[PDB]
Symmetry: D2
Subunit: 205 residues, 4 copies
């Protein structure tokens, strides 16, 4: 799970002296929403469609004249928050959530290699947790001692586990959301509690 595997490569970039209104049209016609800003071959700022639209430099033309001449440099954000291409996917999600952002320029050190957004990170979590694989979504409470998860896992075969998440740490218990697939997945809930495990609920993957 790397940023590389989910980023969009070769994004559109813009220059600081690019006129605000030109930047806007560029974002419209190429389907993007944020625009990293290059100068001297280095990343010097970042602009979103919002930033451009909410730009504030009056009558209708003093204003209109002012927007017409406002440049990207005057509205771009810095310093820009970025992630390394080779970073774990989860780092991007962390950065995005911490700082309220929906998008993130992807770097190799000083170079720009792509862009990763919130919907890219969503796709990634959807893939690696198997949210599209059907099977069964099982919430189960296991004792919160080190060896318990290994013991719970023996009930699943012949079926497979694709992902486990901790819904909650509880007094005496760790509450797992578990997705299982494959052979005789329907048998899993039985086996789990017949093996003395505490099965909270079960629905389709």
């Amino acid at each position: 799970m790397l940023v590389r595997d989910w980023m969009t490569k070769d994004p559109v970039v813009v220059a600081p002296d690019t006129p605000v209104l030109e930047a806007i049209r560029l974002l419209k016609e190429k389907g993007f929403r944020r625009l990293p800003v290059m100068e001297g071959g280095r990343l010097v700022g970042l602009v979103t469609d919002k930033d451009l639209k909410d730009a504030m430099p009056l009558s209708v033309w003093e204003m209109n004249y002012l927007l017409a001449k406002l440049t990207v440099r005057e509205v771009m954000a810095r310093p820009v928050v970025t992630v390394e291409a080779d970073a774990p996917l989860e780092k991007a999600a962390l950065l995005m959530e911490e700082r309220k952002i929906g998008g993130l320029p992807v770097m190799e050190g000083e170079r720009l290699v792509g862009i990763i957004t919130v919907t890219d990170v969503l796709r990634a979590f959807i893939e690696v947790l198997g949210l599209k694989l059907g099977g069964l979504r099982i919430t189960v409470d296991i004792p919160d001692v080190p060896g318990a998860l290994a013991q719970m896992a023996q009930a699943v075969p012949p079926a497979n586990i694709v992902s486990i998440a901790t819904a909650a740490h509880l007094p005496g218990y760790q509450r797992l959301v578990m997705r299982v697939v494959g052979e005789d997945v329907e048998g899993v809930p039985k086996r789990l509690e017949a093996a003395g495990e505490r099965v909270v609920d079960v629905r389709p993957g």
Copy 2:
């Protein structure tokens, strides 16, 4: 993991006859970005800040006069895609990613109880997968036979497993990204491969 646990409750709503420009200012001053549209006490449409801004009904005043009178009804989207409050968190992420959306009205049947966004879903995944718990992030390749994960898990104690994801299904092997925490977590990589497991890489949680 329910939509309930991550949604923002009691969102701002608007009426179809609300003027487009009034809706915009409402979104500015209350910090939201999408606006469900209520009528007759039912959800009849949905509008984003983008929808409102990109509205197209001319000189500067014919246009200006036209925006001034354009109503929410003329630009709202339907039918609105929603999720039930009691739905698993993962359902929201699925809906958002499928349909390119960043936000989702939350319902109890016909009633409106809140709103859940992409950053809410991010927070949720960040919590349940433990991306903020430190410990160790371990990519490990285990044989892709039913019983293998149970066997791999016995190496972790005295440390705990908080979450497992499948980075990839490979020939002969399932590649897991595993986050482990607690007592002697540093010992885990040793134990894993000393137990014959195939440890791909290790970095800090």
Copy 3:
């Protein structure tokens, strides 16, 4: 020559609480350019198309929202300069030129009966000076003694004089621009100087 004879009757009026953008459209669709403002059945202000257009109450929508709600009261001019319907036409021209204005509400005391503009005053001067009657335009220098004009005028018959203007008061001489029409107008220049008058130049009416 009265204001009455040249004014446009029953002009469009507006109220102080009329929205600026509504006033603008009203001026577009009825062909006017200034809008007297009535309240309580009295004249309380005056607005031009310029005043409305150059109105200044920001981003593009804060501005747009602001214009949308700006009222005529906030941009109207007062006190309003007016002329009485029964006033000599020349009074309007004087008021318009003194105060740079192109239009003038026409009153009967406190009541509003019409509107007179610069092009109305132009029409009037064009009519009463006969600028469309053809004939001859004669610049002539007569001595600047009281009886001279009477003496110059005897040369015109059988032709008629329609108007006389003073192009300049000169040392020893008053320089007249005179328009003559009718029978044997071509004979006038001859008769004038043959009568010892000083004929500066002659062109077609």
Copy 4:
């Protein structure tokens, strides 16, 4: 009375490729309202502040982007109506009233020497008719036979006549508006009708 004597010399001009919004600001900061358009050293068009403001090339930015790039060439009027510098003042008034215009580029053949407006023409009529000279404004009805005006004029001395206009051609009578000044002007009304002339009314110049 020439256009020369009342025109504003050395007006601001603009080029066809001048951006509409730049032309507008130029008119604001130099106090003019129309802008002749020069190219190749010849007059190729004319633009008013209205023309520029009412320009119509959509969302708020497609529009805004479009105005930003609209050039004077796309909105200028032609062919341009002009007057020769050496033309009689009255020609300008005729052109302005005929064609609804408030301004007129002033030429010497192919060259541009100035600009004359409606308020310039007003000033001129105000000067040559003596509307600011006080004295008496006398409406008088004289018989409409060739010799009558000469005969009426003998009553004015010792006072002077500065201008005569024809308010109306009537059955049997020409109705004159006459402005008289100087010595014993108060005596004129007496003398006129005592000389059998028909004095309609009298007010201050």
